[PDB]
DNA sequence: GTAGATCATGGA
């Protein structure tokens, strides 16, 4: 079998807001599989979200990012008038600083060719042939990606904080997100285990599937 | 210990030996009475150190005191290092080190 | 063929109280968070710089949908239906409509939304923040409340990272006014009455490339708090020497040029073949010539 | 047969709030089973099977009747109009703590008049230390928790819904609707069983009052609410922890930092040397944005992870530092918190030195020596904390050196001043604190400290530790030395 | 067009105690903080300079909303509703009415930054004591002073002014600044400029903020910074928009190869009044006054 | 008859 594609990721600032965190911008410690899947789709310029269902992703944290809060005058659709003062509310948003991680992409379960792994490999091979819009970001549109590159299993050859699918884990990261409400959002429970493995364990792989 | 810390400790020992010599000279000078004062000598030294207002005056006083100390074996062993430390360092830091040496001084039993 | 313009810009040294946080008693807290080596640096939100660019575009003609009413200190919309083909503001910064939040697709048919072609990361202080406050007692013998306040300030330089998908623009020629605004940034929202902090750049590392990634996001750092030397980061130079970040795609200007030239072995360094200009205007003119040639704006 | 509602801690789709809700339901079911031993007594013949990490509910007949019975029995109102959660042991709890819990629930969960109907403002005068203080709380006649059974079941068939239920911020804290113009669609949706869990959430979580030290306690009463939401490891463990927390006095729930409340939730926990202790919790801060704000707003969420060492240190701090004072004025009970305990608890939670921010929080932000005077009352706690320090004994040696120097400096003037003319320790200590506050950079502070040490006369502790203390003074940041000088002043024994 | 007047102004050398903060016990601490290369400098708040400009406008006879009573030491508002069209102070410095038709706030045309001592603060203190052998708790005290020059940076958005002609009184006040809030009884520090670097340009960017440096850490030298000179040499700063006046003119003219430098073709005047007159002529021509 | 807009609705 083809070795799973490894994508080194370095982001200066990242906000993985929680699904139920609407009054305050609480963030996940680790990028959810849904956010990484959306980032990869943006990287290959794929607008359709159902195109690459079945891809498996594994995330290894190269360091523990620090959590910080920033005030923000975020807008909302509360009043019909755009200039009404009710449309602006001040609330906190939690950000993560200096996020470095390695992403494993495995595309054995995809039924549509070419697979997401092949598309990412081709995009990195010939960047001038990639047809996409906007700037690559992880989280919010203003949180641009500093370094995204093809790496090996030992890019830093140090110690890795894996995200293991544990039913007793603390984090509840979604592998599918319903942006309207929460009906179609699908969750999985993870834990961050400090391990010196250079390849993801079996429980570290998360398959992105439709809620159906 | 870094080299700067080593020179700082050597300077502390040099100043302590100089105070030993000066206080021995005083003790020999005022053998009369029940006992020559010790706290008064330390207060005199602190006042004279605090009197210095600029680099030249403080370094002149420090050199005079060091010479009045006597042999000062720690200066014998470390001519260049301690000499360069005194010449180069800001006089306020040298005064701080001298006062630390004063505070950490043990009179001979 | 996509064409992206990424850039890291460093601001001049000065006293800054730009973004601020929720107040606590008399103290107007500067907003801050962790950064490199775990130290606390003062931040400037990305929305602040985007607002500054919006106001720059509004201030010099450049018909914009979101007009800022200076008299009433409120934001007004000329057209409820955003039209990126006509307005610079909607074309560059994008928009989001009411129906954009109650549906999954991007159409509902007129477009429901538009991802802004420009995205800028938040500005962080080049130097770790040390608690510095200013007294604010107002004149007069009548000493009631609302007097004797404290304002937090920071005497360092700020750096931020931006990126634009020039191909994503509805009108390709709109990138030039945005560049002019980035260099001639009027004021990033803050206490300009008490702490007037010009946000005009004094050191740039721009990259005009067709690659979706640019490893030049934060190339300026000196740390050693309470200083303003602002040397180029060692990891950025190492990545330039490694082989990625093609030097022919790099554009370096400002006061960092002097330090770069003063470096030994710089003549034989791979960083030498980058477009390096001490004058920011000259570098911007050359870069805009290249951009116009590549995008067909001629 | 087949359970109509099944809830487990091992379910992969649950968040922390869901598990806290299942824990609250577990406690409520235990209390109800104690109250109603026979399933025939319970409406609809509802019966449950409770395990360590699973809850299963069985009932006969219409789902609406059984759910209504369970929910009505779970959430009740006494004669006085206070919220009466049968999950908690209400006979064992006193009236003041019941009022505290009711006010916390009304200020955090029932923020909106759309989810409660208010009664009259009941005033009760309970005597305390030969003084009758009038508590005034807003009694209720109904709240949404009581009648959520209608929302859980279909209107026509009167059966459990097979689809998702749109919930609001009163069920899930922070589950706000960001865009009010999309109220129908952009609403958080949950399964009926998880909706029931979120209904039972308030039983387990505990409420603390946050005191801002910038404002004086007398000049304004506290209004910020802290919600301690624990991370559930087992139904039995969390149930026992909550029922044990029922012992705490109401004055202990007033804190000056989020970490203090997080540790207070676990303060009563028994530490087993043979068992690796590890607990985690989240503290949610609810605070009015402005003075005229109608309801509190979620401002910050802090995650606290505590280990054996942190719990042991906090228990020692609670045992040795001064407890919360209860200043009683006309019909108001102003509870004066201990700033030192709050600061130390916050430092322990953050994983930094317990003295990390003592200066700028104890001297700079002190109005009329209000915070400074408490140092001499907490002197014993300071001594205990220094003696049982996990590391850094060199700075304790420095404490001894500075205390000897302070003794010499004070004794000089005290010998200069005769009887009657001798000033108390307060004036000299205040002058010393002011002189320490004068220092602005490393050079000035180190110069002043060195001159003070010399003026202190012969220093045996410095002499015995020449190299160590000299290196410590030369190398350490001057702010840390100033903080340690402050806490050596605090623990100074005349 | 959109015209801005940026300027860095350097004060004369003298003893200054204009920036006291919350006192620590006996001694009066003047406001200070970290600056260039990690040393502590004394800062004079920009609100002090704004108050001085307001007082200048009031004394010169201009219509000012907030009238300051010298004998009563209180501030009185002629009109409770701020009217930037009629009052100079409301037009220039803005306002913000925060209490439970006309706008409630204004951004203000004048933007000023804090005044920073050119020389790092050494730590000088002065002892004061009331005369007389009858001594009480308030007998002796300490006041910190600093022997240095203060430099500050300001910016004016001329087009933001409701009346364009109001920029000239502001320039006159900057060159004729009254007492800047401090201890005038014992430390009389004149804040009138003695070295100016102004920029009158339609471009929003300014590279003249805090352009003065010291030759020696403890000295009254006040030389122009090397970065500013380099930015003039490279062509970043247009010499035709540069206005340099004061005692720095002599040092600039004694520079080697001055006649060949682009700094030569800048508006350089030894006399500050001549520089101000020429700049005001240019401003009046540009704004059509 | 139903969804969008509008208005009430909350203290010690």
Subunits with at least 3 CB pairs below 8 A relative to chain A?
Answer: C, D
Secondary structure (DSSP) of C48-115: HHHHHHHHHHHHSS---SEEEETTTTEEEES-SS--TTT-HHHHHHEEE-GGGSS-SSSB---BSEEE
- Of E103, E108, E60, the C-alpha closest to E81 is E103
Number of Cα atoms under 13 Å in the Cβ half of residue E31: 24
**Secondary-structure breakdown of chain B: helix, strand, coil percentages, each rounded to the nearest 5:** 75, 0, 25
Q: Are strands E242-246 and E267-269 parallel, antiparallel or unpaired?
A: parallel
CA E127 to chain centre: 29
Q: Which helix (H) or strand (E) holds D286?
A: strand D278-287
Q: Is A78 on the interface with D (CB under 8 A)?
A: yes
Residue A2 is encoded by which pair of tokens? Answer: 């083809």
Instruction: Note the CA–C1' distance, E247 to F8, in angstroms.
Output: 70
Residue D482 is encoded by which pair of tokens? Answer: 């100033």
DSSP state of E30: B
- Among chain D residues, CA nearest to B9: D467
CB of D485 closer than 8 Å to CB of D428: no
CB of A207 closer than 8 Å to CB of A186: no
Secondary structure (DSSP) of chain C: ---EEEEEEEEPPEEE--S--S-BTTEEPPPEEE-GGG-EEEEE-HHHHHHHHHHHHHHSS---SEEEETTTTEEEES-SS--TTT-HHHHHHEEE-GGGSS-SSSB---BSEEE-SEEEPPEEESS-----EEE-PPSSS---SS-S-EEE-EEE-EEEEEEEEGGG-SSGGGHHHHHHHHHT----SS-TTT------EEEEEEEEES-S--S-TT-B---SSS----PBPHHHHHHHHHS-S-GGGEEEEETHHHHHHHSTTTTTSGGGGSEEESSHHHHHHHHHHHHHHHHT--
Number of Cα atoms under 13 Å in the Cβ half of residue A150: 14
CA E226 to chain centre: 22
E74 forms bridges with which residues in the sheet? E69
3-state secondary structure of D197: helix
Q: Which helix (H) or strand (E) holds E199?
A: strand E193-201
Q: What is the CA radius of gyration of chain E?
A: 21
Please indicate the experimental technique that yielded this structure.
Answer: cryo-EM
Angle between helices D394-416 and D466-475 (to 10 degrees): 90
- Of D387, D275, D419, the C-alpha closest to D320 is D387
Q: With b meaning 16 or more CB within 10 Å and e meaning fewer, what string describes D129-155?
A: eeeebebebebbeebbbbebbebbbee
Nucleic strand F near CB of residue D114 (< 7 Å): yes
**Best to test chain D binding among B43, B50, B103 (most D CBs inside 10 Å):** B103
Q: Where are the alpha helices (DSSP H) in D191-298?
A: 192-204, 235-245, 258-265
The residues, any chain, with a CB within 8 Å of residue B36's CB and separated by 6 or more, are B26, B27, B30
Nucleic strand F near CB of residue D112 (< 7 Å): yes
CB of D341 closer than 8 Å to CB of D318: yes
Instruction: Note the CA–C1' distance, C80 to F6, in angstroms.
Output: 21
- Among chain D residues, CA nearest to A165: D12
- Among chain C residues, CA nearest to E1: C60
- Residues D194, D185: Cα–Cα separation, whole Å: 19
Q: Which helix (H) or strand (E) holds D334?
A: strand D332-336
- Among chain C residues, CA nearest to D299: C22
CA dihedral (C16, C19, C22, C27) in degrees, to 10, reads 10
- Residues E154, C15: Cα–Cα separation, whole Å: 12
Residue D23 is encoded by which pair of tokens? Answer: 């824990």
CB of E226 closer than 8 Å to CB of C255: no
Q: Is B107 on the interface with D (CB under 8 A)?
A: yes
- Of E225, E227, E232, E222, the C-alpha closest to E257 is E232
With tokens 């005030």, the residue in question is A71
Instruction: Note the CA–C1' distance, A22 to F6, in angstroms.
Output: 24
Angle at D106 between CA D262 and CA D187, to 5 degrees: 90
- Residues E16, E30: Cα–Cα separation, whole Å: 9
Q: Is B12 on the interface with D (CB under 8 A)?
A: yes
The residues, any chain, with a CB within 8 Å of residue B70's CB and separated by 6 or more, are B17, B18, B21, B24
Peptide bond into A114 cis (omega under 30): yes
- Residues D186, A47: Cα–Cα separation, whole Å: 23
Residue D395 is encoded by which pair of tokens? Answer: 């700075």
CA C105 to chain centre: 30
**Best to test chain B binding among D448, D454, D471 (most B CBs inside 10 Å):** D454
With tokens 């400790």, the residue in question is B9
CB of E183 closer than 8 Å to CB of E14: no
Nucleic strand F near CB of residue D113 (< 7 Å): yes
- Residues A18, A89: Cα–Cα separation, whole Å: 19
CB of B104 closer than 8 Å to CB of B16: yes
Tell me the backbone φ, ψ of residue D340, rounded to 5 degrees. -65, -45
- Sequence positions preceding breaks in chain E, C–N over 2.5 Å: 100
Q: Are strands C275-277 and C250-254 parallel, antiparallel or unpaired?
A: parallel
Number of Cα atoms under 13 Å in the Cβ half of residue A121: 14
Which among A24, A79, A167 has the least Cβ separation from residue D298? A24
With tokens 């401003």, the residue in question is E283
- Residues D13, D18: Cα–Cα separation, whole Å: 9
CA dihedral (B90, B94, B99, B105) in degrees, to 10, reads 170
A41 forms bridges with which residues in the sheet? none
Contacts of C280 in chain E (CB under 8 A): 236
Contacts of C162 in chain A (CB under 8 A): 144
The residues, any chain, with a CB within 8 Å of residue A117's CB and separated by 6 or more, are A2, A4, A5, A55, A105, A106, A107
Contacts of C38 in chain A (CB under 8 A): 66
Per the structure, the residues numbered 165 to 194 in protein chain D that have their CB within 7 angstroms of any atom of strand F are 181, 184
Q: How far is CA D188 from CA D176, D407, D409, in A?
A: 8, 65, 67
- Residues D83, D105: Cα–Cα separation, whole Å: 8
- Residues C87, C84: Cα–Cα separation, whole Å: 5
Tell if the CB–CB gap between A12 and C115 is shorter than 8 Å: no
Tell me the backbone φ, ψ of residue B26, rounded to 5 degrees. -65, -45
Tell if the CB–CB gap between D215 and C25 is shorter than 8 Å: yes
Cβ count near C145 (within 10 Å): 6
Which among B9, B96, B106 has the least Cβ separation from residue D447? B96
On the 0-12 / 13-18 / 19+ scale of CB atoms within 10 A, D349 is buried
3-state secondary structure of A74: strand
Q: Which helix (H) or strand (E) holds B16?
A: helix B3-29
With tokens 């307001």, the residue in question is E54
Q: How far is CA D5 from CA A128, C90, D71, in A?
A: 56, 50, 14
Q: Which helix (H) or strand (E) holds E5?
A: strand E4-11
CB of E91 closer than 8 Å to CB of E161: yes
Which positions on strand F lie below 7 Å from a protein C-beta?
Answer: 3-6, 8-12
- Of C30, C230, C152, the C-alpha closest to E114 is C152
CB of D257 closer than 8 Å to CB of D346: yes
E43 forms bridges with which residues in the sheet? E116
Q: How far is CA C143 from CA C28, C139, E93, in A?
A: 20, 9, 22
Tell if the CB–CB gap between C186 and E206 is shorter than 8 Å: no
Tell if the CB–CB gap between B8 and D474 is shorter than 8 Å: yes
The residues, any chain, with a CB within 8 Å of residue D327's CB and separated by 6 or more, are D217, D218, D333, D334, D335, D336
CB of D104 closer than 8 Å to CB of D229: no
Residue E154 is encoded by which pair of tokens? Answer: 């300001």
Tell me the backbone φ, ψ of residue E211, rounded to 5 degrees. -95, 5
DSSP state of D39: T
Contacts of B100 in chain D (CB under 8 A): 450, 453, 470, 473
Q: Is A186 left (phi over 0), alpha (psi -120 to 50) or beta?
A: beta
E146 forms bridges with which residues in the sheet? E16
Tell if the CB–CB gap between D441 and E40 is shorter than 8 Å: yes
Q: Where are the alpha helices (DSSP H) in D351-439?
A: 358-362, 373-377, 379-387, 394-416, 425-438
Contact between chain A and chain C (3 or more Cβ pairs less than 8 Å apart): yes
On the 0-12 / 13-18 / 19+ scale of CB atoms within 10 A, D41 is exposed
3-state secondary structure of D329: strand
Subunits with at least 3 CB pairs below 8 A relative to chain E?
Answer: C, D
Nucleic strand F near CB of residue A84 (< 7 Å): no
Cβ count near E137 (within 10 Å): 6
Subunits with at least 3 CB pairs below 8 A relative to chain D?
Answer: A, B, C, E
**Best to test chain E binding among D365, D368, D441 (most E CBs inside 10 Å):** D441
Residue E234 is encoded by which pair of tokens? Answer: 């490279």
On the 0-12 / 13-18 / 19+ scale of CB atoms within 10 A, B30 is exposed
CB of C162 closer than 8 Å to CB of C120: yes
- Residues D14, D8: Cα–Cα separation, whole Å: 9
Nucleic strand F near CB of residue D121 (< 7 Å): yes
Nucleic strand F near CB of residue D136 (< 7 Å): yes
Cβ count near C5 (within 10 Å): 23
**Best to test chain E binding among D437, D447, D486 (most E CBs inside 10 Å):** D437
3-state secondary structure of E82: coil
With tokens 């998360």, the residue in question is A206
Nucleic strand F near CB of residue D122 (< 7 Å): no
A176 forms bridges with which residues in the sheet? A186
Give the dihedral sign, CA D374/D375/D378/D380: negative
Tell me the backbone φ, ψ of residue E106, rounded to 5 degrees. -145, 145
- Residues E160, E155: Cα–Cα separation, whole Å: 12
CB of C53 closer than 8 Å to CB of C185: yes
Experimental structure resolution, Å: 2.8
Residue D386 is encoded by which pair of tokens? Answer: 């220094």
Tell if the CB–CB gap between A181 and D174 is shorter than 8 Å: no
CB of C292 closer than 8 Å to CB of C284: no
Q: Is D132 on the interface with C (CB under 8 A)?
A: no
Q: What is the distance in angstroms between the Cα of E133 and the nearest Cα belonging to chain C? A: 32
Contact between chain C and chain D (3 or more Cβ pairs less than 8 Å apart): yes
Q: Which helix (H) or strand (E) holds E248?
A: helix E248-253
- Residues A158, E35: Cα–Cα separation, whole Å: 39
Angle at D258 between CA D256 and CA D260, to 5 degrees: 70
Tell if the CB–CB gap between E207 and C12 is shorter than 8 Å: yes
Tell if the CB–CB gap between D451 and B46 is shorter than 8 Å: yes
Contacts of C146 in chain E (CB under 8 A): 98
Of all protein residues, which has its CA closest to the C1' atom of F4?
D181
- Residues E11, E212: Cα–Cα separation, whole Å: 11
Q: Where are the alpha helices (DSSP H) in D51-111?
A: 63-74, 95-108
- Residues B27, B45: Cα–Cα separation, whole Å: 15
DSSP state of E36: G
């Amino acid at each position: 079998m083809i070795a799973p594609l490894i994508l080194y990721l370095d982001v200066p600032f990242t906000t993985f807001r929680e699904s139920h965190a609407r009054e305050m911008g609480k963030t996940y410690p680790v990028p959810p599989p849904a956010t990484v899947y959306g980032m990869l789709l943006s990287l290959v310029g794929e607008t359709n979200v159902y195109r690459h269902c079945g891809v498996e992703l594994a995330i290894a944290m190269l360091s523990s990012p620090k959590k910080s809060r920033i005030l923000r005058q975020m807008r909302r659709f509360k009043n019909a008038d755009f200039s009404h003062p009710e449309n602006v509310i001040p609330c906190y948003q939690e950000i993560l600083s200096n996020l470095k991680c390695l992403i494993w992409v495995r595309s054995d379960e995809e039924k549509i060719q070419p697979s997401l792994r092949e598309r990412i490999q081709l995009a990195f091979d010939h960047p001038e042939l990639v047809r996409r819009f906007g700037c690559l970001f992880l989280g919010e549109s203003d949180q641009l990606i500093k370094t995204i590159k093809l790496a090996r299993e030992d890019y830093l050859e140090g110690v890795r904080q894996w995200a293991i699918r544990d039913n007793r884990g603390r984090l509840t990261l979604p592998y599918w997100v319903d942006h309207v409400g929460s009906r179609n959002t699908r969750f999985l429970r993870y834990r961050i285990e400090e391990m010196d493995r250079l390849s993801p364990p079996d429980l570290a792989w998360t398959m992105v599937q439709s809620p159906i | 210990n870094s080299e700067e810390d080593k020179q700082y400790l050597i300077f502390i020992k040099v100043f302590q030996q100089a105070m030993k010599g000066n206080f021995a000279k005083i003790y020999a000078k005022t053998e009369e009475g029940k006992d020559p004062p010790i706290k008064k000598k330390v207060e005199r030294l602190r006042a004279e150190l605090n009197y210095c207002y600029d680099e030249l005056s403080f370094k002149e006083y420090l050199s005079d005191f060091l010479v009045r100390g006597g042999l000062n074996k720690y200066f014998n062993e470390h001519q260049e290092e301690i000499a360069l430390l005194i010449k180069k360092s800001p006089w306020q830091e040298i005064r701080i080190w001298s006062l630390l040496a004063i505070a950490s001084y043990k009179p001979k039993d | 063929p996509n064409y992206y313009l990424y850039g890291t810009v460093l601001t001049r040294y000065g006293l800054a109280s730009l973004n601020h946080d929720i107040r606590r008693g008399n103290k107007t807290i500067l907003q801050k968070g962790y950064w490199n080596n775990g130290k606390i640096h003062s931040f400037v939100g990305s929305s602040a710089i985007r607002w500054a660019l919006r106001f720059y575009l509004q201030k010099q003609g450049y018909l914009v949908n979101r007009v800022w009413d200076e008299e009433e200190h409120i934001n007004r919309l000329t057209s409820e239906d955003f039209d990126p083909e006509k307005f610079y503001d909607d074309d560059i910064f994008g928009f989001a409509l009411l129906e954009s939040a109650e549906t999954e697709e991007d159409t509902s048919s007129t477009p429901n939304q538009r991802m802004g072609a420009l995205g800028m990361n938040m500005a962080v202080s080049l130097t770790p923040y040390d608690g510095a406050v200013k007294l604010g007692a107002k004149s007069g013998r009548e000493k009631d409340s609302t007097s004797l306040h404290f304002t937090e300030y920071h005497a360092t330089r700020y750096q931020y990272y931006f990126g634009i998908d020039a191909t994503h623009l509805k009108d390709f020629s709109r990138i030039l006014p945005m560049i002019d605004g980035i260099m001639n940034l009027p004021k990033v929202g803050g206490s300009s009455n008490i702490f007037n902090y010009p946000f005009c750049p004094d050191s740039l590392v721009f990259q005009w490339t067709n690659h979706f990634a640019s490893y030049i996001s934060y190339c300026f750092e000196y740390c050693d708090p309470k200083s303003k030397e602002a040397k180029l980061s060692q990891e950025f130079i190492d990545e330039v020497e490694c082989g990625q970040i093609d030097p022919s795609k790099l554009w370096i200007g400002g006061t960092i040029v002097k330090d770069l030239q003063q470096l030994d072995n710089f003549e034989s360094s791979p960083l030498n073949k980058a477009h390096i200009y001490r004058n920011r205007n000259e570098m911007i003119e050359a870069l805009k010539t290249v951009i116009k040639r590549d995008l067909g704006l001629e | 047969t087949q359970p109509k509602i099944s809830l487990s801690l091992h379910a992969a789709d649950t968040t922390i709030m869901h598990r806290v809700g299942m824990t609250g339901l577990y406690m409520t079911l235990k209390r109800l089973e104690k109250q109603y031993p026979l399933s025939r007594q319970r409406g609809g013949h509802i019966s449950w099977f409770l395990t360590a990490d699973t809850i299963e509910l069985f009932w006969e007949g219409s789902d609406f009747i059984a759910l209504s019975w369970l929910i009505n029995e779970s959430f009740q109102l006494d004669d006085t109009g206070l919220i009466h959660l049968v999950g908690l042991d209400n006979d064992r709890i006193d009236l003041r703590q019941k009022i505290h819990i009711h006010e916390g629930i009304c200020g955090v969960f029932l923020r909106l008049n759309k989810f409660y109907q208010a009664g009259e403002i009941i005033n009760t005068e309970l005597r305390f230390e030969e003084k009758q203080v009038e508590y005034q709380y807003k009694s209720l006649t109904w709240y949404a928790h009581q009648t959520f059974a209608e929302k859980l079941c279909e209107a026509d068939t009167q059966q459990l819904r097979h689809d998702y239920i749109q919930i609001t911020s009163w069920l899930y804290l922070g589950g706000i609707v960001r865009h009010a113009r999309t109220q129908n669609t952009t609403k958080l949706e949950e399964k009926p069983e998880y909706a029931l869990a979120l209904l039972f959430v308030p039983v387990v979580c505990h409420y603390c009052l946050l005191h801002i030290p910038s404002e004086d306690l007398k000049e304004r009463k506290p209004h910020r609410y802290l919600v301690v939401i624990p991370e559930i490891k087992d139904f039995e463990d969390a149930s026992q922890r909550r029922w044990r927390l029922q012992q705490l006095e109401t004055k202990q729930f007033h804190v000056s930092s989020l970490g203090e409340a997080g540790l207070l939730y676990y303060s009563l926990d028994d530490i087993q040397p043979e068992v690796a202790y590890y607990q985690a919790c989240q503290v949610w801060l609810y605070e009015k944005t402005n003075k005229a704000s109608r309801q509190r707003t979620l401002m910050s969420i802090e995650e606290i992870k505590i280990d054996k060492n942190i719990l042991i240190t906090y228990q020692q701090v609670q045992k040795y530092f001064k407890t919360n004072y209860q200043i009683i004025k006309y019909k108001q009970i102003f509870i004066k918190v201990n700033p030192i305990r709050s600061l130390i608890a916050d430092n322990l939670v953050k994983g930094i030195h317990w003295w990390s921010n003592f200066w700028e929080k104890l001297v700079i932000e002190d109005s009329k020596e209000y915070l400074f005077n408490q140092l001499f009352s907490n002197r014993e706690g300071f001594i205990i904390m220094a003696e049982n320090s996990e590391e850094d004994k060199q700075y304790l040696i420095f404490i001894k050196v500075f205390q000897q120097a302070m003794k010499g400096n004070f004794a000089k003037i005290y010998a200069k001043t005769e009887e009657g003319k001798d000033p108390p320790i307060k004036k000299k200590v205040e002058r010393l604190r002011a002189e320490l506050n004068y220092c602005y950079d490393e050079l000035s502070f180190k110069e002043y400290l060195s001159d003070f040490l010399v003026r202190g006369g012969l220093n045996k502790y410095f002499n015995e530790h020449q190299e160590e203390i000299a290196l410590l003074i030369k190398k350490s940041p001057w702010q840390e030395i100033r903080i340690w000088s402050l806490l050596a002043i605090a623990s100074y024994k005349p």
